[PDB]
């Protein structure tokens, strides 16, 4: 009914990529241990300070229709990752942005983006198989504490509290988080009360505790892989083994291969160092060796406790790859007229 504006070819792709880049640049400043926070103005009260990828993504709406379409697709990526895992939304956002950019710049007159998407799906399936091959189950409560601490932005006390809750009520016991009226966090028999002074602080801490609980639930329901994005880096040889069916599938496989390095470079970049050199030295190093951004040095991640649930990284990669690959098949964009 309403009048529509139709955009063709690389112009619409460029506008959507600008929107995706804006949303992903806003989200990616909160990734890793040395990541900052984002203040979102709240209409009815005090602003909200958050380090969560999905919370930042869902709060960004753009005036331009095509940039808003791209932003909405990235929000879909982040929301799907949040609902199916509870953690890993920033990683999914950066992976989706990388895949979308790689697919957009590789579109030519003779290229077939549908077969590129197919090759992306096969590459992601291979990477997921490698990740499942590289997982190790959680056998000790210390691993649970390490996972909770890593997912709580390196907070020892949150991990200790979650480990105590899992010891008290069992590994599969019901655990919930409710805001506390005191300065410190406490545990009741499980119910977690979050300490703080203002509502913004308790909300940020509650978001981090919820992320830690979701991540440790995923880590106990599935295996454990290395942290820092190195688990995704170790799957490049799996893609090297695969053979393409045609040129477009080769393009998609190379897109996924280039994207697999993105989380580690983002984590290093937030730490103030050069991500490319860090990733190159990680790949040249041994399989057990990774990069600690908080300490800023190459260590053994299992010993240091830098580990991630394999479910979180698996679902983040899958959602980001699927949505971005579907996006790259675009040729025409139809939007409503901005009345």
Judged by CB under 8 A, the chain residues 200 through 239 that form the site for a copy of itself are: 200-201, 204
Residue for token pair 């020892």: 156
Contact 46, 200 (CB under 8 A): yes
Contact 6, 334 (CB under 8 A): yes
Rounded Cα distance between 248 and 95, Å, is 20
Judged by CB under 8 A, the chain residues 241 through 280 that form the site for a copy of itself are: 272, 274, 276-277, 280
Closest by CA to 314, choosing from 252, 239, 249, 223, is 223
Give the count of alpha carbons within 13 A of 161, CB side only. Answer: 25
Q: Does position 86 bind K ion by CB under 5 A?
A: no
Judged by CB under 5 A, the chain residues 152 through 191 that form the site for K ion are: none
Judged by CB under 8 A, the chain residues 62 through 121 that form the site for a copy of itself are: 62-63, 65, 68-69, 72-73, 75-77, 80, 109-114
What is the contact mask toward ligand ADP in residues 27 to 66, using x (rule: CB under 6 A)?
---xxxx-x-----------------x-------------
Judged by CB under 5 A, the chain residues 4 through 43 that form the site for K ion are: 30
Query: Which range touches K ion (CB under 5 A), out of 74-82, 89-97, 254-262, 266-274?
Result: 89-97
CA distances, 6 to each of 10, 20, 227, 313, 318 (Å)? 13, 19, 44, 37, 31
Q: Dihedrals φ, ψ of 66, to 5°?
A: -75, -45
In whole angstroms, the minimum distance from the beta carbon of 33 to ligand ADP comes to 4
Q: Which of 16, 17, 150, 202 binds ligand ADP (CB under 6 A)?
A: 150
Q: Does position 53 bind K ion by CB under 5 A?
A: yes
Residue 115 CA to its chain's centroid (Å):
26
Residue 292 φ/ψ region, left for φ over 0, alpha for ψ in the -120 to 50 degree band, beta for the rest: beta
In whole angstroms, the minimum distance from the beta carbon of 330 to ligand ADP comes to 16
Q: Which of 18, 134, 160, 335 binds a copy of itself (CB under 8 A)?
A: 335
Please tell me whether 89 is known to bind a ligand.
yes
Please tell me whether 125 is known to bind a ligand.
no
In whole angstroms, the minimum distance from the beta carbon of 214 to Mg ion comes to 9
Please tell me whether 91 is known to bind a ligand.
yes
């Amino acid at each position: 009914g309403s009048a529509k504006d139709v955009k063709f070819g690389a112009d619409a792709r460029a506008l959507m990529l600008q929107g995706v880049d804006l949303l992903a640049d806003a989200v990616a400043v909160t990734m890793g241990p040395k990541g900052r926070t984002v203040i979102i103005e709240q209409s009815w009260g005090s602003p909200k300070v958050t380090k969560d990828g999905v919370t930042v993504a869902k709060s960004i709406d753009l005036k331009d229709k095509y940039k808003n379409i791209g932003a909405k697709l990235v929000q879909d990526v982040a929301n799907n990752t949040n609902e199916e895992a509870g953690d890993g939304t920033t990683t999914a956002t950066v992976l989706a942005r990388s895949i979308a950019k790689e697919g957009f710049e590789k579109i030519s007159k003779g290229a077939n983006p549908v077969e590129i998407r197919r090759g992306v799906m096969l590459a992601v399936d291979a990477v997921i198989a490698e990740l499942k091959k590289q997982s190790k189950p959680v056998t000790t409560p210390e691993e649970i504490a390490q996972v909770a601490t890593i997912s709580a932005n390196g907070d020892k006390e949150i991990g200790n509290i979650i480990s105590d809750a899992m010891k008290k009520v069992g590994r599969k016991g019901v655990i919930t988080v409710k805001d506390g009226k005191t300065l410190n966090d406490e545990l009741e028999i499980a119910v977690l009360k979050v300490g703080g002074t203002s509502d913004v602080e308790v909300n940020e801490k509650k978001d981090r505790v919820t992320d830690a609980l979701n991540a440790t639930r995923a880590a106990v329901e599935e295996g454990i892989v290395l942290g820092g994005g190195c688990a995704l880096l170790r799957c490049i040889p799996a893609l090297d083994s695969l053979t393409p069916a045609n040129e477009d599938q080769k393009i998609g496989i190379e897109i996924i291969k280039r994207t697999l390095k993105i989380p580690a470079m983002t984590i290093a970049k937030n730490a103030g160092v050069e991500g490319s050199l860090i990733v190159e030295k990680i790949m040249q190093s041994s399989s057990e060796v990774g990069y600690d951004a908080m300490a800023g040095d190459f260590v053994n991640m299992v010993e240091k406790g830098i580990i991630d649930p394999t479910k979180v990284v698996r679902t983040a990669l899958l959602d980001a790859a699927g949505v971005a690959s579907l996006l790259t098949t675009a040729e025409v964009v139809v939007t409503e007229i901005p009345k």
